[PDB]
Structure formats: structure tokens, C-alpha cells
Amino acid sequence: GSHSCSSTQFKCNSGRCIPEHWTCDGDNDCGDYSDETHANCTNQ
Ligand SMILES: [Ca+2]
């Protein structure tokens, strides 16, 4: 599809896509730490 990421993915600030369940999980999956920010943790 023309969308950036799939329906089950989290969109990193860099534009990289990662599985949504990978947010606030202890690993910097995005590489830019956007999936591990305090903000995303409070959304869990
Ligand atoms: Ca992570």
C-alpha cells in the first residue's frame, strides 16, 4: 500500500517501521529511541 507502515506497525521518528508490540520494551528497535520514549511508555 501507499501508506508508510502496515496496520500492525509503529512508525519510528526516522520513518522506519517496527512491530507495534516493540514499543517501550527495553530495546531501541527504531535506532533513534523513538519507540522507547517516556511518552510511548505512558501509552502502554
Ligand atoms: Ca523497543
Short mmCIF file of C-alpha atoms in Angstrom, two decimals, residues 1-42:
data_model
loop_
_atom_site.label_atom_id
_atom_site.label_comp_id
_atom_site.label_asym_id
_atom_site.label_seq_id
_atom_site.Cartn_x
_atom_site.Cartn_y
_atom_site.Cartn_z
CA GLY A 1 0.00 0.00 0.00
CA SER A 2 0.91 3.68 -0.30
CA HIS A 3 0.94 4.13 3.49
CA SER A 4 4.30 4.33 5.26
CA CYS A 5 3.81 1.40 7.64
CA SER A 6 1.44 -1.58 7.96
CA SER A 7 -1.58 -1.55 10.29
CA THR A 8 0.33 -3.56 12.90
CA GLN A 9 3.47 -1.42 12.94
CA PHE A 10 4.77 1.53 14.95
CA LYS A 11 6.19 4.40 12.90
CA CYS A 12 9.61 5.50 14.18
CA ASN A 13 10.50 9.20 14.08
CA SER A 14 13.07 8.28 11.40
CA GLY A 15 10.32 6.79 9.24
CA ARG A 16 11.43 3.23 9.96
CA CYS A 17 8.62 0.78 10.75
CA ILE A 18 8.64 -1.79 13.55
CA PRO A 19 6.11 -4.24 15.04
CA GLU A 20 3.79 -2.27 17.34
CA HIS A 21 4.38 -4.56 20.33
CA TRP A 22 8.03 -3.47 20.26
CA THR A 23 7.21 -0.12 21.89
CA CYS A 24 8.63 0.56 25.38
CA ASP A 25 10.11 -2.93 25.66
CA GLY A 26 13.74 -2.34 26.63
CA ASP A 27 15.19 -2.45 23.12
CA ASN A 28 15.96 0.52 20.88
CA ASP A 29 14.31 -1.14 17.87
CA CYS A 30 13.98 2.13 15.97
CA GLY A 31 17.63 3.04 16.36
CA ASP A 32 16.61 6.59 17.29
CA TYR A 33 14.98 5.54 20.58
CA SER A 34 11.57 6.85 19.49
CA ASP A 35 9.91 3.52 20.35
CA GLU A 36 11.35 3.68 23.88
CA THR A 37 10.50 7.27 24.88
CA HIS A 38 8.77 8.07 28.16
CA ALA A 39 5.76 9.25 26.12
CA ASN A 40 5.24 5.87 24.45
CA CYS A 41 5.63 4.01 27.75
CA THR A 42 2.79 6.00 29.32
#
